[PDB]
């Protein structure tokens, strides 16, 4: 029975509005409704992994697991195994996998982050799950961010707190936050970003939605504009939106958007918005393709509609050779040549690098670099040909060309990371000096760049 090199992953996000679901929710898991939908000829083909994020979920874990599992069994005639379930308040994540995957899945982690302070602490935040699927690390985050059209900057702050403080994946990757710990990271939820148009335009917006004319609405979507200005979700992807706004509906129909201010809304308007979103970030040159992104039309218990997204994702096998794991393979080496970091910092500490990768027995610390001043005010840290030669555990190019090197640049004075990035070993050539590049971030914001050349020796 061969190991897969690609799996499909279902991501769902649904703010249930504190109401029990209707008796049939299969359209969600089939990616049917509006937007980029799944072909009918695939309806009986199970996804490998289903990740369900809810917000304002009124059900017990047991109640929701029975609904989810019975839904999937009806669609696929497969009884899924529960990988993980984690709930913070009314925010929940469930991961289900085909039974054949049970022994491929290990290192299962869960965590949550509560956002805000005092007044603003007690219902918003995120839950997440991570695990290994054979040689591939997968992370999933369901967040319920701050509500309200005038609170986009709080949502952005909620995002940074979640990526800083959510503790998932390999704890040995100490300089790295969740935006660098996984081959594939999916971040979804009720992100609560709104269409920023004047209140007076509510009926105009409704008109546009009825005509399926979303362009002048998407151009005011706060998540798209904040991303374009690099204020949030830096280096994440989102599929183009081709479905109607998923909030705020009158319950029990989808014919009406309920936008006007009421005591129940704190006297706030809720113009039609794409609150409910799925984004992802995968390591460079790893296969990931969105094959659906849309909303259901027939699940109407909540003031939100469910949102689905599905993905092809590249995965790798748990590689064994006669040498590694348990030793190095001296037919392999990674040389970083003529490298330099460009940093936005004003500090004048010396810096060193750490190289982290599951192709190494343990992380590798460099010598300190040589600081120079850039012509436009920047710090340039030069490493020369001084960098340690990295000794991978396995030299076979079928393994090594699929790996990645995480890089942290750290202050000698504080040992704190000033920037994190990732280099793919999926090179055009071996035994050849080739350019490499990564942006560097810290707490998910841009702090600099790392560039230079690499020379990769494999056993071929
Ligand atoms: F749904 C799931 C999926 C995975 C698991 C954990 N399986 C661990 C692997 C390694 C050791 C033997 O199986 C439980 C439930």
Curated annotation (Swiss-Prot):
Specifically expressed in immune and hematopoietic cells. Expressed in bone marrow and blood cells. Levels vary considerably within this compartment. Present in at least 74% of immature CD34+ cells, whereas within the more mature population of CD33+ cells, it is present in only 10% of cells. Present in the majority of T-cells, while it is present in a minority of B-cells (at protein level). Belongs to the inositol 1,4,5-trisphosphate 5-phosphatase family. Interacts with tyrosine phosphorylated form of SHC1. Interacts with tyrosine phosphorylated form of DOK1. Interacts with tyrosine phosphorylated form of DOK3. Interacts with tyrosine phosphorylated form of SLAMF1/CD150. Interacts with PTPN11 in response to IL-3. Interacts with receptor EPOR. Interacts with receptors MS4A2/FCER1B and FCER1G. Interacts with receptors FCGR2B and FCGR3. Interacts with receptor FCGR2A, leading to regulate gene expression during the phagocytic process. Interacts with GRB2. Interacts with PLCG1. Interacts with tyrosine kinases SRC and TEC. Interacts with c-Met/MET. Tyrosine phosphorylated by the members of the SRC family after exposure to a diverse array of extracellular stimuli such as cytokines, growth factors, antibodies, chemokines, integrin ligands and hypertonic and oxidative stress. Phosphorylated upon IgG receptor FCGR2B-binding. This is Phosphatidylinositol 3,4,5-trisphosphate 5-phosphatase 1. It comes from the Eukaryota. It is found in: Cytoplasm; Cell membrane; Membrane raft; Cytoplasm, Cytoskeleton. The chain holds residues 398 to 857 of 1189 of the full protein. Phosphatidylinositol (PtdIns) phosphatase that specifically hydrolyzes the 5-phosphate of phosphatidylinositol-3,4,5-trisphosphate (PtdIns(3,4,5)P3) to produce PtdIns(3,4)P2, thereby negatively regulating the PI3K (phosphoinositide 3-kinase) pathways. Able also to hydrolyzes the 5-phosphate of phosphatidylinositol-4,5-bisphosphate (PtdIns(4,5)P3) and inositol 1,3,4,5-tetrakisphosphate. Acts as a negative regulator of B-cell antigen receptor signaling. The SH2 domain interacts with tyrosine phosphorylated forms of proteins such as SHC1 or PTPN11/SHP-2. It competes with that of GRB2 for binding to phosphorylated SHC1 to inhibit the Ras pathway. It is also required for tyrosine phosphorylation. The NPXY sequence motif found in many tyrosine-phosphorylated proteins is required for the specific binding of the PID domain.
């Amino acid at each position: 029975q061969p190991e897969p090199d690609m799996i499909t992953i279902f991501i769902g996000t649904w703010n249930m509005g504190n109401a029990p679901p209707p008796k049939k929710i299969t359209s969600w898991f089939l990616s049917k409704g509006q937007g980029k939908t799944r072909d009918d000829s695939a309806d009986y083909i199970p996804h490998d992994i289903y990740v369900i994020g809810t917000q304002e979920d009124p059900l017990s874990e047991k109640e929701w697991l029975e609904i989810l599992k019975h839904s999937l069994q009806e669609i696929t005639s497969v009884t899924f195994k529960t990988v993980a379930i984690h709930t913070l308040w009314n925010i929940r994540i469930v991961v289900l996998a085909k039974p054949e995957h049970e022994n491929r899945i290990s290192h299962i982690c869960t965590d949550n982050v509560k956002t805000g302070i005092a007044n603003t602490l007690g219902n918003k935040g995120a839950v997440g799950v991570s695990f290994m699927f054979n040689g591939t690390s997968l992370g999933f985050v369901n967040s319920h961010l701050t509500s309200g059209s005038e609170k986009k900057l709080r949502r952005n702050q909620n995002y940074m707190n979640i990526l800083r403080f959510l503790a998932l994946g390999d704890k040995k990757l100490s300089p790295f936050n969740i935006t660098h710990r996984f081959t594939h990271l999916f971040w979804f939820g009720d992100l609560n970003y709104r269409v920023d148009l004047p209140t007076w335009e509510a009926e105009t917006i409704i008109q546009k939605i009825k005509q399926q004319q979303y362009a002048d609405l998407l151009s005011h979507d706060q998540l798209l504009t904040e991303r374009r200005e690099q204020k949030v979700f830096l280096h994440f992807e989102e599929e183009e939106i081709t479905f109607a706004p998923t909030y705020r509906f009158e319950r029990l129909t989808r014919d009406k958007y309920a936008y006007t201010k009421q005591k129940a809304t704190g006297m706030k308007y809720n113009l039609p918005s794409w609150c409910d979103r799925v984004l992802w970030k995968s390591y460079p040159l790893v296969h990931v393709v969105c094959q659906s992104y849309g909303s259901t039309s027939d699940i109407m218990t909540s003031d939100h509609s469910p949102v689905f997204a599905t993905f092809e994702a590249g995965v790798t096998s748990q590689f064994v050779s006669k040498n590694g794991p348990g030793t190095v393979d001296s037919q392999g080496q990674i040389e970083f040549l003529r490298c330099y970091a460009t940093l936005k910092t004003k500090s004048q500490t010396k810096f060193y690098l750490e190289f982290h990768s599951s192709c190494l027995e343990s992380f590798v610390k460099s010598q300190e670099g040589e600081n120079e001043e850039g012509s436009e005010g920047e710090l340039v840290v030069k490493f020369g040909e001084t960098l340690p030669k990295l000794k991978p555990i396995i030299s076979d190019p079928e393994y090594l060309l699929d790996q990645h090197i995480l890089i942290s640049i750290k202050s000698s004075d504080s040992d704190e990371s000033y920037g994190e990035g990732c280099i793919a070993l999926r090179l055009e050539a071996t035994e050849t000096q080739l350019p490499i590049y990564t942006p560097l971030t810290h707490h998910g914001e841009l702090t600099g760049h790392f560039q230079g050349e690499i020379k990769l020796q494999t056993s071929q």
